[PDB]
Nucleic acid binder design. Structure first.
Length: 437
RNA sequence: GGCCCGGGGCGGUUCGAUUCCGCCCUGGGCCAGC
């Protein structure tokens, strides 16, 4: 029930078992031969090449080295030809440039084209930098592979493992740099508790300093921040997570939490107890990749949240969920209904010119003075949050992300009441309201 | 696609807008993809 005790039990959940390892080995061997028969110049990279992959995430990464002088077109075409001839099954994928994904003797494989270069400068795509990251990591991580797995298991279990937009957490590469720096999972965790939003971790200089933002400098390029996409709040959840684990080590820190679903009836009662306005904007999920979609759901959610606050509906928090089918932007406000009348600030009494224009507007109520300036009573076009967002979304669809906005323009609706509790959003709502138990 | 910085045009709203809500062109930086 002590740190060392728990970590020994944790390796069991993070380290791949013999069969998963053997399987991976037989795929590597078979893949090596198929490539050598074609006399292809390649290099194995990633967590599989450095035996640092988390149990259950076996995936082999093969990068095809190409002469610096080739056109990007050659790399894709020849790269496609090679992946095609060497994979049991294939499928083109797309990052900054297209590549090939597939299977070999049961395991997931990525056949990626890149330039074989000496010295990081002259890098044309992120994929060119990968081989360099690999060379730097291969000699320094050796011997600490399980410290990397324990760290990965910890972040994954707690929903902040990857660096893609759906997570905004800690990439694999970042985890290995963290181990090379701190020496182990426990040391990483012990020190992370002292991290601030101004921390700068420079692996190459073996230094830690104060910067303007959380910055983990890439050993292979000092101008690159490896944790660039680690969100501020995620950085915060990690720090607090380390403080907790060191205070009461548990195996539950490496185990994914059960969705702990709640019956909608109880949900309704809680929204009743809160006396707030809870609603969602439902529309169709545009057919695009998570990496383009989630940042859009974030913008759309934010723009609307801001509309709600300047409109005085006192928004508490927002959320959002995607599905195969639709997208939901969730909201909770403190004001279910606001009066129709509100007060507008006018000019100071001395301003005769502007006071006159301020009174020229025929209004239903006749303005008044207070503290030296005129004020007017005006009437709102809407008096409820839902009613406000129907207006906002209908006319400001274009500011909600290129795709999400285009979809909301062609269709959207606002759900509330029971009708909401029946949509695939009860989990997001529970996280958004702090529902506990 | 999203984020940061900067140019040139507009619409709306307001007593009053560079200053709030937004739309066109447009220069550079960065992020995810592995």
């Amino acid at each position: 029930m002590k740190v060392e005790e728990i970590l020994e039990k944790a390796l069991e959940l993070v380290i791949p078992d013999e069969e998963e390892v053997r399987k991976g080995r037989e795929a590597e061997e078979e893949l090596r031969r198929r490539l050598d028969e074609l006399g292809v110049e390649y290099v194995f990279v990633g967590s599989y090449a450095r035996n640092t992959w988390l149990k259950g995430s076996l995936e082999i990464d093969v990068f095809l080295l190409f002469p610096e002088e080739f056109s990007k077109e050659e790399l894709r075409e020849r790269g496609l030809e090679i992946g095609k001839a060497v994979l049991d099954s294939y499928e083109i994928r797309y990052a900054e440039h297209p590549y090939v994904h597939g299977v070999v003797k049961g395991v997931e494989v990525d056949v990626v084209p890149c330039y074989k270069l000496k010295e990081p400068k002259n890098i044309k795509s992120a994929v060119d930098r990968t081989p360099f990251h690999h060379k730097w990591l291969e000699g320094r991580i050796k011997g600490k592979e399980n410290e990397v797995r324990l760290l990965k298991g910890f972040l994954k279990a707690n929903g902040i493992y990857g660096a893609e937009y759906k997570v905004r957490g800690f990439s694999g590469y970042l985890c290995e740099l963290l181990i090379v720096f701190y020496g182990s999972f426990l040391e990483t965790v012990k020190n992370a508790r002292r991290w601030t939003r101004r921390t700068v971790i420079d692996v190459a200089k073996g230094e830690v300093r104060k910067g303007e933002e959380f910055f983990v400098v890439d050993p292979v390029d000092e101008k690159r921040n490896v944790a660039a996409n680690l969100s501020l709040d995620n950085l915060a959840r990690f720090v607090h997570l380390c403080r907790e684990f060191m205070e009461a080590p548990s195996l539950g820190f490496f185990k994914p939490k059960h969705p702990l679903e709640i019956e909608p009836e109880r949900l309704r009662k809680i929204v009743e107890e809160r006396g707030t306005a809870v609603f969602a904007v439902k529309f169709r999920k545009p057919d695009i990749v998570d990496d383009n979609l989630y940042p859009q759901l974030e913008r759309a959610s934010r723009k609307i949240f801001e509309f709600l606050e300047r409109e005085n509906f006192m928004p508490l928090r927002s959320a959002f969920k995607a599905s195969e089918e639709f997208c939901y932007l969730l909201f909770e406000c403190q004001i279910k209904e606001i009066s129709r009348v509100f007060r507008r600030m006018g000019p100071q009494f001395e301003d005769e010119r502007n006071v006159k224009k301020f009174l020229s507007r025929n209004r239903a109520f006749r303005p008044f003075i207070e503290n030296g300036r005129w004020w007017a009573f005006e009437m709102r076009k809407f008096t409820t949050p839902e009613e406000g967002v129907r207006s906002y979304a209908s006319t400001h669809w274009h500011t909600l992300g290129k795709n999400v906005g285009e979809s909301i323009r062609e269709y959207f609706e606002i759900i509330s009441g029971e009708k909401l509790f029946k949509e695939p959003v009860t989990a997001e709502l529970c996280e958004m309201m702090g529902v506990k138990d």
